[PDB]
Structures are given as structure tokens and as C-alpha cells.
Design a protein around this motif. Sequence first.
Motif, PDB file in Angstrom:
ATOM      1  N   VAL A  50       0.709  -1.111   0.206  1.00 25.01           N
ATOM      2  CA  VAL A  50      -0.154   0.164  -0.019  1.00 25.01           C
ATOM      3  C   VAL A  50       0.896   1.203  -0.050  1.00 25.01           C
ATOM      4  N   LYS A  51       0.565   2.239  -0.909  1.00 19.89           N
ATOM      5  CA  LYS A  51       1.404   3.336  -1.002  1.00 19.89           C
ATOM      6  C   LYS A  51       1.278   4.194   0.539  1.00 19.89           C
ATOM      7  N   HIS A  52       0.159   4.306   1.127  1.00 17.49           N
ATOM      8  CA  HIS A  52       0.151   4.916   2.364  1.00 17.49           C
ATOM      9  C   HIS A  52       0.175   4.177   3.461  1.00 17.49           C
ATOM     10  N   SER A  53       1.077   4.355   4.671  1.00 20.35           N
ATOM     11  CA  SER A  53       1.022   3.547   5.535  1.00 20.35           C
ATOM     12  C   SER A  53       0.319   4.280   6.845  1.00 20.35           C
ATOM     13  N   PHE A  54      -0.723   3.281   7.283  1.00 18.63           N
ATOM     14  CA  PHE A  54      -1.833   3.751   8.290  1.00 18.63           C
ATOM     15  C   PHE A  54      -1.208   3.581   9.665  1.00 18.63           C
ATOM     16  N   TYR A  55       0.009   2.935   9.952  1.00 25.80           N
ATOM     17  CA  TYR A  55       0.771   2.820  11.313  1.00 25.80           C
ATOM     18  C   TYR A  55       1.155   3.999  11.865  1.00 25.80           C
ATOM     19  N   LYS A  56       1.947   4.833  11.003  1.00 21.65           N
ATOM     20  CA  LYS A  56       2.398   6.034  11.311  1.00 21.65           C
ATOM     21  C   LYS A  56       1.032   7.000  11.978  1.00 21.65           C
ATOM     22  N   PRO A  57      -0.008   7.041  11.202  1.00 24.12           N
ATOM     23  CA  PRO A  57      -1.298   7.711  11.708  1.00 24.12           C
ATOM     24  C   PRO A  57      -1.748   7.008  12.995  1.00 24.12           C
ATOM     25  N   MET A 113       5.981   0.433   6.852  1.00 24.00           N
ATOM     26  CA  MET A 113       5.816   1.750   5.560  1.00 24.00           C
ATOM     27  C   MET A 113       5.443   0.981   4.372  1.00 24.00           C
ATOM     28  N   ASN A 114       5.097  -0.064   4.245  1.00 17.56           N
ATOM     29  CA  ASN A 114       4.658  -0.530   2.831  1.00 17.56           C
ATOM     30  C   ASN A 114       3.638  -1.554   2.661  1.00 17.56           C
ATOM     31  N   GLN A 115       3.441  -2.303   3.816  1.00 15.79           N
ATOM     32  CA  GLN A 115       2.318  -3.316   3.577  1.00 15.79           C
ATOM     33  C   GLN A 115       1.199  -3.194   4.698  1.00 15.79           C
ATOM     34  N   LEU A 116      -0.043  -4.074   4.626  1.00 15.38           N
ATOM     35  CA  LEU A 116      -1.036  -4.061   5.354  1.00 15.38           C
ATOM     36  C   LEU A 116      -1.627  -5.353   5.503  1.00 15.38           C
ATOM     37  N   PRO A 117      -2.184  -5.683   7.027  1.00 12.84           N
ATOM     38  CA  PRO A 117      -2.364  -7.006   7.133  1.00 12.84           C
ATOM     39  C   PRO A 117      -3.774  -7.213   7.018  1.00 12.84           C
ATOM     40  N   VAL A 118      -4.321  -8.299   6.494  1.00 11.97           N
ATOM     41  CA  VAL A 118      -5.464  -8.967   6.481  1.00 11.97           C
ATOM     42  C   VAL A 118      -5.408 -10.565   6.765  1.00 11.97           C
ATOM     43  N   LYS A 119      -6.554 -11.150   7.027  1.00 14.13           N
ATOM     44  CA  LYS A 119      -6.682 -12.492   7.239  1.00 14.13           C
ATOM     45  C   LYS A 119      -7.594 -13.230   6.050  1.00 14.13           C
ATOM     46  N   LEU A 120      -7.543 -14.570   6.005  1.00 15.38           N
ATOM     47  CA  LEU A 120      -8.434 -15.129   5.018  1.00 15.38           C
ATOM     48  C   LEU A 120      -9.254 -16.235   5.655  1.00 15.38           C
ATOM     49  N   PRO A 121     -10.328 -15.939   5.755  1.00 15.18           N
ATOM     50  CA  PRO A 121     -11.154 -16.823   6.711  1.00 15.18           C
ATOM     51  C   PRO A 121     -11.703 -18.038   5.827  1.00 15.18           C
ATOM     52  N   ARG A 122     -12.059 -19.097   6.243  1.00 15.08           N
ATOM     53  CA  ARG A 122     -12.747 -20.084   5.715  1.00 15.08           C
ATOM     54  C   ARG A 122     -14.244 -19.744   5.422  1.00 15.08           C
ATOM     55  N   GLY A 123     -14.515 -18.546   5.006  1.00 15.28           N
ATOM     56  CA  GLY A 123     -15.722 -17.884   4.579  1.00 15.28           C
ATOM     57  C   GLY A 123     -15.823 -17.039   3.591  1.00 15.28           C
ATOM     58  N   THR A 124     -17.277 -16.774   3.149  1.00 13.60           N
ATOM     59  CA  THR A 124     -17.323 -16.155   1.973  1.00 13.60           C
ATOM     60  C   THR A 124     -16.734 -14.709   1.856  1.00 13.60           C
ATOM     61  N   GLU A 140      -6.147   9.908   0.163  1.00 15.79           N
ATOM     62  CA  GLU A 140      -5.312   8.450   0.228  1.00 15.79           C
ATOM     63  C   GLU A 140      -6.230   7.377   0.271  1.00 15.79           C
ATOM     64  N   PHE A 141      -7.485   7.498   1.235  1.00  9.91           N
ATOM     65  CA  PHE A 141      -8.246   6.327   1.469  1.00  9.91           C
ATOM     66  C   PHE A 141      -8.773   5.970  -0.017  1.00  9.91           C
ATOM     67  N   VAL A 142      -9.078   6.812  -1.089  1.00 15.11           N
ATOM     68  CA  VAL A 142      -9.464   6.258  -2.337  1.00 15.11           C
ATOM     69  C   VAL A 142      -8.343   5.430  -2.945  1.00 15.11           C
ATOM     70  N   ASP A 143      -7.097   5.921  -3.000  1.00 14.20           N
ATOM     71  CA  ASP A 143      -6.099   5.185  -3.448  1.00 14.20           C
ATOM     72  C   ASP A 143      -6.027   3.800  -2.591  1.00 14.20           C
ATOM     73  N   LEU A 173      -6.710   0.502  -4.665  1.00 13.56           N
ATOM     74  CA  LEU A 173      -5.361  -0.774  -4.692  1.00 13.56           C
ATOM     75  C   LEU A 173      -5.990  -2.172  -4.284  1.00 13.56           C
ATOM     76  N   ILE A 174      -6.489  -2.020  -2.799  1.00  7.41           N
ATOM     77  CA  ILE A 174      -7.188  -3.229  -2.066  1.00  7.41           C
ATOM     78  C   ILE A 174      -7.940  -3.866  -2.847  1.00  7.41           C
ATOM     79  N   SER A 175      -9.238  -3.423  -3.741  1.00 10.49           N
ATOM     80  CA  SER A 175     -10.051  -3.745  -4.409  1.00 10.49           C
ATOM     81  C   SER A 175      -9.392  -4.566  -5.616  1.00 10.49           C
ATOM     82  N   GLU A 176      -8.531  -3.980  -6.463  1.00  6.42           N
ATOM     83  CA  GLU A 176      -8.026  -4.506  -7.399  1.00  6.42           C
ATOM     84  C   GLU A 176      -7.090  -5.725  -7.337  1.00  6.42           C
TER      85      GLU A 176
END
Lengths: 142, 256, 254, 247, 133
Positions: free
Chosen positions: B53-60, B182-193, B209-212, B216-219
Motif C-alpha cells: 500500500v502506498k500510504h502507511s496507516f501505522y504512522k497515523p 511503511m509498505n504493507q497492510l494486514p488481512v486474514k483469509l477466513p474459511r468464509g465467503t 489516500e483512502f481512495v487510493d 488498490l485493495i479492491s484490485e
Amino acid sequence: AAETFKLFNKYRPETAAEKKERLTKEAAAVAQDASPKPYAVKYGLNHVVALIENKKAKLVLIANDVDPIELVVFLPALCKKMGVPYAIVKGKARLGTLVNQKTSAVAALTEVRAEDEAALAKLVSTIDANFADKYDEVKKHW
Amino acid sequence: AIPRERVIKAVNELIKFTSKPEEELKKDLQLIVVNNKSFTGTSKSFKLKLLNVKHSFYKPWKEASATAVKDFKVLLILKDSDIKKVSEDDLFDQLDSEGIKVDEIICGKDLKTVYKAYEARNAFISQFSLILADDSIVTSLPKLMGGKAYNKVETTPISIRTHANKEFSLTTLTNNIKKVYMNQLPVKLPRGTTLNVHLGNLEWLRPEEFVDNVELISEQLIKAYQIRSIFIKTNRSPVLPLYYNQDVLDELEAKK
Amino acid sequence: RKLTRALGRGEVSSAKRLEENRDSYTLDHIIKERYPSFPDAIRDIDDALNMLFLFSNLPSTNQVSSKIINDAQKICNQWLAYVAKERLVRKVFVSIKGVYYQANIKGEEVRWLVPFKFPENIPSDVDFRIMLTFLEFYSTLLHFVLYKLYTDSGLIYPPKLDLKKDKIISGLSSYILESRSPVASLFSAFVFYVSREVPIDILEFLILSCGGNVISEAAMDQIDMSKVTHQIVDRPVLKNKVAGRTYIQPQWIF
Amino acid sequence: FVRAESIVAKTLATSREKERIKRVSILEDKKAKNETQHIASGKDFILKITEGLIREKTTYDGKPALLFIVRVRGPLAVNIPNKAFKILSLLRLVETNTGVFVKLTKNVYPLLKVIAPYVVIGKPSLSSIRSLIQKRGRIIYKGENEAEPHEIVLNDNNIVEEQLGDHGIICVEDIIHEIATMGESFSVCNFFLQPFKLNREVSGFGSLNRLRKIKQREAESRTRQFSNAATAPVIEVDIDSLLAKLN
Amino acid sequence: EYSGIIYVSRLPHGFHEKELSKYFAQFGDLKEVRLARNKKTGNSRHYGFLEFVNKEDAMIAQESMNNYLLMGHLLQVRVLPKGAKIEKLYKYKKRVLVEKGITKPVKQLKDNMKQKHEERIKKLAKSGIEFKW
RNA sequence: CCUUCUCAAACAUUCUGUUUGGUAGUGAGUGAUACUGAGUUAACUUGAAAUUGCUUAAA
């Protein structure tokens, strides 16, 4: 009793050979920092009475076989008046094994390691349930 | 794909809902992503996917936590044999400039002795907000850390690389930590839809930056995950219908 | 008693210190008192050699220790190495109960029995403590004699062992002796090639004592046969012959 | 009397051993099916541990190797699972202080994986093999006038011919050569030979032998390694030194 | 007064029905040993019940195990009064998910998806949001 | 009265990057907001809490 001694044998104090090694390291670093903070059981009778009166003691073990008995006959009452958890165990010889002596009148834990705080608290609760509620009525009778 | 007009109108609608005449909890933006055949399958996965991700939410996060009582901190679990080589002082020297702060350097022996009690372990694990663990030890962590740690997506560890070739390397460790922060974001992959992405808080970061980030997450998710449905959402909020596919549902009966 | 006390109190560190800070008895003063004359020590060396060779062949049991057996084997190997180096084997007699050797040790005829290398079934109905006591005394006497003979003959005692040759074939060939007729001159420049089934230890000791070098087919199994002058091989019907070699049997050497 | 703590510790240890064997079985199933889609790693590791302790991690070549396997008692409170029990029984290493020779191939690597907590694995030197055969070699032999057979020592050489004559194996040295060279009829000779019964490293319960047992257990904890990961290197040690101690 | 049935709580891991029965059999014959278990993933809930032939054996077991320390758990054992026996606590395994028949075909499920979208469309305005499509 | 899956593959050499794979958890409970009675989805309380959905580690 087996659980209590398994706890205390992790805090069995320094032997003379180990003290020579540690003083060897300090002499290297002499010419706080040189050695870490020690954790050990406290065992002298006057020392432990002082620790109880200052409420520094977290658990006290009292031998049941002391001659003269007048040396420890006041300790349970003192520990009750001070709020310190205490337990009467069989064997001054077994207590002395904990502190590198032939016999020991008392033993005590005042400070424990972080990985042993929970074990100490559970041991205190166990002694409370098995020893305070069990013997409270009978220890007051002839 | 998703045009920015939908995203900006969604942000305006969300701010309208969130200005209604606690606050931080209901201000967090969740990007619900819905999949046709779940994301992993019949076998679970606690591995946390890191997305560029271009924008790192961890510094905010750091700034907002400094203003608040949240007390942002970073935990760094490492191998028992390299915790001796890693030093807090080298960490401060190599990470002070880039805005990275590692609070405590813990060990598997620490999770086995110092916190081998549910109360102490839960307190220690819940205090921190970001966890970085050597990928050697992440496999053994779920027994050491427990299930309460892996339950919430904030507390579960992130697998990081600390060795260079066959041996540990401080430069590798610091580069991987900075890149993760400053370059990545975390998600999990459930056994769910469905799953959701924690972009952050509307108070913390700007819509420009929320738009970007949402685009990027969607794509990135739809590129590989055969995503059919994607929903923007806030807490105590209606689902914001954004994306809608009419393709993947054919293979539902083929699998059936 | 004191070690029991340390263990029963749980001070393993002090137990280890006590064990380290102790010394067992020696028997060298007893050796000196019993045998004041080196000829007398050589005179009585025979039953010592016999018991040492008997013990070296035993497996380890609950009573006899692997340490004891290995020490006995080492003493036997050193004695055989010295005898082969100085070439003083005079007579050999193969019987059913192993092989008898007679050597000329400093003018004294010394005879001993070596059992064949087979797994003997130990009866355990005889007292092993007495046999171990005799083994201890005989080992002390044999150490004394071996040091004396090595120094007089000019070698270094104890000889340094070669670990690669110990890995290859454990026995006589491992010990290497560094310094500072017609039996002894026999078999000058003769290369024997020992097949598998021939007893390699017996043959190698006899050949090295009576001159000549050995190439063992067994010793090559770990991982030439061009300069071999003799070949020894036991078989009902052997395979094809080199027709440039010479074939003999162990009884020929004996 | 049987204590609750003993019961519970046994249950927990056995459950963990079952889990380890299950994950090893799944990993080796996937490896044999030759699928690397979802696998921790797709090859076989061997850890040479010799003398602190120096370790070497190597990849299995795949060429058959003459291994020596000595049974040792596994961790306390672990009741052996059925899979390991069957593998050990097929290797006829049911009781401790025994040893056998085994061929090492890709078909034998997963078995070593399953039985790792109960055995010590090494590559013996020719001296060790010869000492074992010449000191502790026993066979089951039957007589013409004997209704039921009995186990004997390997003293007589004519028995070797009369039993295994069609394979060209004529003598005890032929047996030793076949084992050391890992040639044909090795399996037949291995079946002919009984499992080598070794002696205990320390026996007795005097104060000296108790201290020896304490030291021995310390060294064993140093050397033997218990891992529950399916990507576990097969651990091999100085079997020659162990055999010089036990023989 | 007191019955012959015992309630056991604060159990550690690895103290299941078989382990409890094995341990408490050496106190006497048993008629029922049951343990609380979780439904979704089979796991003990750290309590259970046991039934003794002899109520005096049950009381003796309670006196023996009342405040026993057992690998960090201070066990609790209580003799129950008359009645109130074990009625439930069936040993549940780890449940595995099972697919259910999708009787609705592709067309029916796509029409259902269309109607769900329609419900979103007619629900957003009442909720209080305005957004395109 | 045991003690916990402590790293693998390729591509590139840029004192290092990329991809991929590897992680089945103490129990109980509160809770919102939706996605398809089964699978999913923010936070929250707790003493390791809790009343019924092989044999020489032997003696």
C-alpha cells in the motif's frame, strides 16, 4: 508439601563453590552491573522473624520438629498478626536441605521470579484451602 | 475498474453518517470483500496476508495513539538463538530515523515461562498493537501465543524475514521491519465467503489516500481471489454497495 | 558414604566435585614387592597374558565392564605389537581352543593361549569378582613389563594408536611403534594376500613376527593385488586362478 | 495406587506424540504423492551430530546406506502409538538395548521419521560391524533330533554353509562382508542373524552408579533431540562411540 | 443428606472421561463417568460428574480430592444431595462441516441475488444514506 | 507433575530483493453491523476462573 518443595528447590541459595565463581566474575568487572539480582529463600530464624515483622515475606515454612520448641512456638501467631502466609512442614532436616544446612528452623520466600509469581500464588491459595480452613478449629483446642 | 467518483461519494456519505448530531470505534473503515468459494478452503490459515500500500496507516496509528491512551507499541518476537545477538540499542540506532520503534524483544522461552499463565500472557499480548515475528518461529507461535491472540486481526503475528542466506542479519531484519511497517497492510483469509480490510480511521487519514487505498485493495484482491462482491462499511453502518459481479456464480453448481 | 549424602541432599554439583576429587589405589608398589627381578616378572607373565587374552574376547555384561574389556584388549594389542616388531615368536600351535604361541622374551620361553574370535557363551556360574581382581593385578604387572621391554628395546610406551586403522580393522595393526634367526629373517620381501575367510589377526601377527607384509581382503571392504607373492584362501572349490600367483593354506605358514 | 498426575501426564504426552506422528504421516503422504502445492518443504534432511556439539544438515542422496539402529527408551509418559509400534516390531526392536542393521532408501526414510523418538541411528564403521558380529552374534538353530529349536551363538562356521549355502555365503566373514559392502543376500543374512543384544551403559544403584546415570542422562539430553515438526531431519550420531561403550 | 454422585471441577487438560474413570476406579466401582465438552470444537469444559455404587466411597473420594493441587489446578470435588444426577454432557467430537444441497439452480440463485440487491436499494434510503446504485 | 510444527524451494547477487508454501487455538461469557441453521464478519471480562447445550527413571 511435595509441590511446595518443588517450588523452593528452584530458589535453593548459593553454594560456596558458586560464590567463588561469581566473585571471580566480579573481580574481572570491578577493574550492580557485574552480577544480577539474586533470588533465594531466606532461612535464618531471626532474619525471618524480622522479615515477617516487616511483612516482606510472601510465604513462611516452619519445621514441626524444633527442640527447644520455644524457638518457633510464637511464629504462627506472629504470622497471623502480620498477615503473612505460613505453613508447618515436617522436617527441619528437609528445610535444611533447601538451604545447604543439616537442619533449618524456618524458610521463607520474599521475592520470586516472574515465571514463578503465579505458582507462588497458587501454592499460597492451596495452603490456605488445605491448611488454614482445615486446621483452624483443631489447632485452638488442647 | 472501480471509478474514483463512487469512492469519493462514498467517503462523503460516510462522513455525513459519522457527523451525526465510542467515536473512534465507530469511525473505523472496514472494506468487506466477499468471495465465491471463500479464500482458503477447508483448511484454516492464520497466516496474515501483507498487501503493498502506498500510504502507511501505522504512522497515523502512532500519532493517534500518542494523542490517546491506546499506547501504540511494536512487539518483535524472534528466535531463542538470535535474541542474544539482537540489541535494543542497535534497533534504536537503525530505526530511530524512519519512525519505527520496537518496544520489547521477547523470546519463545519467555512465552513458555514468563507468560505461561493466561492472565499475564493476555495482558502482555493485548497491550501491543502490532506484532512482528521471525517466520521461523511464527509456525510455533500459535501454541505459545494462544487462541485469544490470533482471534483478533490486530494481535495475530506477522511473519517477517530476519536471516540473510543461512544466517541471521541485522540489516535484513531492519529492512524487513521498515518495509513491513511503511509498505504493507494486514488481512486474514477466513474459511468464509467474506472478509474485511482494516484501512484505519477516518480521523487518522485523508480521503485523498483512502481512495487510493480502497482502489488498490479492491484490485489486488479481485486479481487473484475471484471476488464477486465488495462492500465498504463502518461500524453500526449500512453496507455501502460498491462492486457487483455476475460471473463467478456459474461455477457454484459446477462445484456442487 | 559422602557421595551418598550429596546425592540424597540433591547437591549434584558437590557430588560431581567429590567424584572428580578422588583417587583410586595403585598396585605398583605391590608389583615391586612381589617381583623384584625382571626375569621373575617375565617368568610369571604367562598366566597374566592368558587371563588378559581371555577377558579381551568377552562381551560386556552386568558384571564385566566395557572399560575393563577395552583396557584388556589394549594391553593385548600392545604386547602383540611389541612381539611382532621385535620378531621373537618362536613356536605356534593351532588347537581347537584357539592358538598357543611360544616366544623368546629376554631368554625366557613365554607361552600363552589366544581364543578364536567367536561369541563365547559366558556361564556366569563362576565368581567374576575374583577373576576381575586377578585381572587388575595382572594388568598392573603387564603394564610394568611392557614399559620395561619397550624402553629396553628402544620404543616409546605407550605407543600412539592410529585412529584410521582402528576404524578399518581393530587390533594389532593399529598400534604403531616409533623409536627413541632364521625365524626373524624369514619371509624377507614376501607379500601375502589374505582372503576373507582366513583368520586375519592370527595370520598378520605370525607374518609380521616372521617377516613379510600382509594385504587383507577384509580390510579393503571399507573403501591393488599386483605385487602379491602368496595368496592364502580356504574354499572347497575356488574360482579361476591368476596363474601368476602362488596359493597356500594357513597350516602351511604354521 | 495410580496417581492422577501420572495419568494426566501420560495422556498429554501420548496425545502430543500422536499429533506429531499424524503430521509426519500427512507430510510423507503428500511427498510420496509428489505434490508440492501445500507443503512445508519437499525433501529429506539428515543431521549429523558429533563432537560442544557440532551439527551438519545434509540432503539425503537416496543411495542405500548401511545404518545401525539401537533401541532406546523413549520419553516418559508416552505410550507408543500403534504406527510406531508396528514399525518397530517389523524391525524387531521391541525392547530396549538391542540393535539391528537396516538398509537406508527413500522407502525407509519416513519409517525413520516415525520411529525417531525411540531409536538411535548411525553409520557403523567396519570395526564396529566386525566387533558386533564377533562378540554378540546369535542365531536360531534347529537340530535333526530336536523337536523344538533354540537360540545359539555364531560359534560354528559349518552352520553358515548348511543354512545359507545357495547364496554363496560360506562363513561368518562372508556375512560380515555382505553387511559391510551392502551387497545382495544382505537381507537374508540380516534375517538369519538375531538382533544384537547390547548391554546397559550404566547398571546398578550405588552412589557411584547413580552419579554415572545422572551424567549419562545429561549427555543424552545434550545429544538426542525431540522435535514435533514434520520437517524433522533424521538425527544420526557417533554410533561407533556408542557401540564402543555398549560392546 | 448426601448421595453417591460427585461433581468435579477445575480439571486440567488431559483429564477426560476415561482418565477420570481410571483414576477414580481405584476408589471403587463406578456406574457413570461424564465430562462437559464443547460443541463446535471438541474440548473439555473442565468439569464433570461421577457416580459411585457406595455413597461412602463417594464421600471418601471427595475428602481425598477436595483441594488437591494437580499440575496448577486446585481441584474441587463435591458430593451432591439426593437426585440431580447426570442428564447431559454427551461426549462431542470435533465437528466437521458438511455441505447442504443447493436445490435452487443458477437462475434461481441469480434472481435471489437480484432481489437481495433490490432489498439493499429499498433499504438504504430508509436507513438514511444516499449513494448512486 | 509431561512440556509446545524455532524454515524450505526457485529467480536474481544488489553484505539483499521477489514469489510461493509452511501456523487447527484453555473454557465460559458480553456484544454490534452485515455476507452465503451450516460457513463468515469490529470490540469486550476473566486466578489455568468452570453444576449438567519400552521398564536398571528400580527398590
